């Protein structure tokens, strides 16, 4: 269809813009996480925290890099509310919703399909995108070893701890916290397996 | 009187607080979820801290004692300086997670109380993590020597 | 094959220990890294 | 022809890096090539490449790790911990 074709192409341009936005945020978060990993200026805790956070972010981004948009919910009230497997908003235009998350409460009317009982939805298009390009318009109006293993690991970690200096031998400003009183050999073993 | 505050700072904070208000709306309007909201706020305030940093080091003179102590690689970073004259910024829960309520006050303008009762969590967390770090290091080292 | 001992700047001397130096060089800055959490 | 068709949708692909997008189709890939962004198996590399591409792999990975965190170390100190991991052979045929 000529109209189907023009639409399909416009929606493809829209999704390509969304994907370019995504790629930009991806490079941004990557660079930020890199330069926080290297120096970060501050101290450990904040550095590790920022790192884990930007890692979660890079995940949340990449996880949806193939099949981001799920469809549309053009509403009765001359208004649209696109959908996808992520959240994307125009930080400038007062966070107008360009792409809700499939979990949101405003995106529950992507799974209610009745015999003319819509909340405020009139048209509904479930796109058959492959990974990055829209195709369809779809209107829907031996418990012996383990013992010795674990015991040898416990003993190795106990030796590790006995290896570090102790408070009866320190040469520091004031008695601070030490490995020997925050974690036990057995957890220092669990956390390397 | 040598620890200088940049004057392009309050504009910044009001702008970004307006953005945060918009997000609060998008949360109350059923258009978003809690944790993604907090992530968005985090993004915004990190951007604001970066802006503050660039403005600060665009405003300080070239002969200032602090900037000279830093730029000569002797001591410190521009994060310490930003926090001493700009805004400490976001801080962490005891679970590592960030908080969307930042610290918009520096160690010169003077912190408030509740902008000071959330700055402890990470401090104690770090003063305890140091020892475990030393322990894992000793472990790796004893192994590599074995 | 080793080359020069970075401490001296000249070639390495027979009888030197170079398996310990490596472990120390490595595990000294191991504090400056991003370990897993502890919760 | 060999096939690795159990490829989770979670991991995306290898970025082609041909001057920058997802790995293409009908593209050249060598014996020692990856097919999904992440980390390989040193044992895989040893069974399919040998004791000269797995040592390099280990050194490269360890040093890039130590390099993205503000640290400076040589490689003749990593290549002394590796040499001590391929000095023994499991004997299939006596
Ligand atoms: Mg001291």
UniProtKB/Swiss-Prot annotation, chain D:
Family that this chain belongs to: Belongs to the RNA polymerase beta' chain family.
Role, per record: DNA-dependent RNA polymerase catalyzes the transcription of DNA into RNA using the four ribonucleoside triphosphates as substrates.
Subunit structure, interactors included: The RNAP catalytic core consists of 2 alpha, 1 beta, 1 beta' and 1 omega subunit. When a sigma factor is associated with the core the holoenzyme is formed, which can initiate transcription.
Identification of the protein by name: DNA-directed RNA polymerase subunit beta'
Source organism of the structure: Mycolicibacterium smegmatis (strain ATCC 700084 / mc(2)155)
Name of the gene: rpoC
């Amino acid at each position: 269809g000529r109209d189907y074709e023009d639409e399909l192409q416009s929606e493809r341009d829209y999704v390509a813009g969304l994907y370019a936005r995504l790629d930009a945020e991806r490079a941004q978060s990557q660079r930020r996480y890199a330069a926080a990993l290297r120096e970060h200026g501050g101290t450990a805790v904040e550095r590790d925290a920022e790192v884990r956070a930007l890692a979660k972010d890079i995940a949340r981004l990449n996880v949806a890099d193939n099949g981001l948009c799920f469809g549309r919910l053009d509403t009765l009230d001359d208004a649209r509310l696109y959908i996808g497997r992520l959240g994307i908003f125009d930080r400038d235009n007062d966070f107008e919703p360009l792409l809700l998350d499939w979990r949101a409460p405003m995106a529950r009317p992507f799974y209610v399909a009745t015999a003319a009982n819509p909340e405020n939805m009139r048209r509904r298009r479930q796109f058959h995108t492959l990974g990055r390009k829209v195709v369809d318009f779809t209107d829907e109006i031996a418990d012996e070893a383990a013992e010795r293993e674990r015991r040898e690991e416990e003993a190795y970690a106990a030796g590790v701890l006995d290896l570090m200096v102790d408070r009866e031998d320190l040469m520091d400003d004031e008695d601070h916290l030490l490995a020997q009183d925050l974690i036990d050999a057995e957890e220092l073993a669990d956390r390397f397996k | 009187a040598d620890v200088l505050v940049p004057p392009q700072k309050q504009e910044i904070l009001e702008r970004h607080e307006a953005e945060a208000d918009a997000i609060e709306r998008k949360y109350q309007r059923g258009a978003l979820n809690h944790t993604e909201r907090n992530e968005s706020l985090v993004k915004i305030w990190q951007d604001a801290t970066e802006e503050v940093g660039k403005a600060l080091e665009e405003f300080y003179p070239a002969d200032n004692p602090i900037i000279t102590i830093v730029k000569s690689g002797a001591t410190g970073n521009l994060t310490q300086t930003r926090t001493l004259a700009g805004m400490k910024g976001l801080v962490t829960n005891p679970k590592g997670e960030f908080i969307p309520r930042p610290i918009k006050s520096s160690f010169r303008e003077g912190l408030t109380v509740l902008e000071y009762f959330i700055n402890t969590h990470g401090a104690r967390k770090g003063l305890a993590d140091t020892a475990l770090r030393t322990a894992d290091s000793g472990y790796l080292t004893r192994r590599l020597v074995d | 094959c080793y080359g020069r001992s970075m401490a001296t700047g000249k070639l390495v001397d027979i009888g030197e220990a170079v398996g310990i130096v490596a472990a120390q060089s490595i595990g000294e800055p191991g504090t400056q890294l991003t370990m897993r959490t502890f919760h | 022809e060999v096939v690795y068709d159990k490829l989770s949708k979670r991991q995306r692909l290898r970025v082609i890096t041909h001057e920058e997008g997802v790995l293409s189709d009908g593209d050249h890939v060598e014996v020692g090539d990856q097919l999904m962004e992440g980390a390989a198996d040193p044992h895989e590399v040893l069974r399919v490449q040998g004791p000269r591409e797995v040592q390099i792999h280990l050194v490269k990975e360890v040093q890039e790790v130590y390099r993205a965190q503000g640290v400076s170390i040589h490689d003749k100190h990593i290549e002394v911990i590796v040499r001590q991991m391929l000095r023994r052979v499991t004997i299939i045929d006596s």
